Design a protein around this ligand. Structure first.
Ligand SMILES: *[C@@H](C(=O)O)[C@H](O)C(=O)N[C@@H](CC(C)C)C(=O)NCCCCNC(N)=[NH2+]
Length: 212
């Protein structure tokens, strides 16, 4: 793997979005990975629809939270519309996926990253943006301003985010709380060495889409 990577710089990352006040991070996390792998494979960077997952992927619990596996599987089974055609409404509504006839993006599957292991995660991000989770309950995280975040934070993960890169000592994370949070929407989180739940539990549960 390269010493560092920034998928933003490689053009595989769309502008930061704002999920609030709907607790639909699961959808934002998944969509960002889809946006990323689509660019890597097809050369196209297009903002895709969190609202479709929200309205249509109902194994997850809408604004009350959801799952990486079910949301990734949704895109395998059904593909996903652009954000432009299916915009965010900040709340679950009727699944209108069938009513929309515009451009869609499909994936063919997804892979789970072996958990609690630095290099397994780093190796995955080297290839594509990855869906990851963090413990976001704390003042330090919620009011993060900038720099490499080393703590304080627990490992009781409750928020799904997107790993869009790393450096020697950190993982670059796209958050979904708008561009006014952290570093223009992003947080750089310390790389815990080796076997570890990771800083803020960032090694806990990681998945990435496959577009073959
Ligand atoms: C996170 C957010 O929008 O801030 C959102 O609550 C969420 O989807 N969180 C996930 C985090 C996991 C580590 C992937 C989550 O909690 N998913 C499980 C189901 C949601 C909670 N359960 C119920 N009963 N709603």
């Amino acid at each position: 793997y390269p010493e560092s990577i920034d998928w933003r710089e490689k053009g595989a990352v769309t502008p930061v979005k704002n999920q609030n006040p709907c607790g639909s991070c699961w959808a934002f996390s998944t969509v960002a990975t889809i946006e990323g792998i689509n660019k890597i494979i097809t050369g196209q960077l297009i903002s895709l629809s969190e609202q479709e997952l929200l309205d249509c992927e109902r194994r997850s619990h809408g604004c009350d939270g959801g799952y990486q596996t079910t949301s990734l599987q949704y895109v395998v089974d059904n593909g996903v519309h652009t954000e432009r055609e299916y915009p965010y409404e900040k709340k679950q509504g009727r699944c209108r996926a069938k009513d929309k006839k515009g451009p869609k993006v499909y994936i063919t599957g997804y892979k789970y990253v072996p958990a609690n292991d630095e290099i397994s995660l780093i190796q995955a991000i080297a290839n594509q943006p990855v869906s990851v989770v963090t413990d976001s309950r704390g003042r330090g995280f919620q009011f993060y301003k900038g720099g490499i975040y080393e703590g304080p934070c627990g490992t009781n993960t409750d928020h799904a985010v997107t790993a869009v890169g790393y450096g020697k000592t950190y993982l670059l994370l796209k958050n979904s709380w708008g561009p006014n949070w952290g570093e223009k929407g992003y947080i750089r989180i310390k790389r815990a060495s080796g076997r570890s739940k990771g800083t803020c539990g960032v090694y806990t549960s990681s998945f990435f889409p496959i577009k073959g």
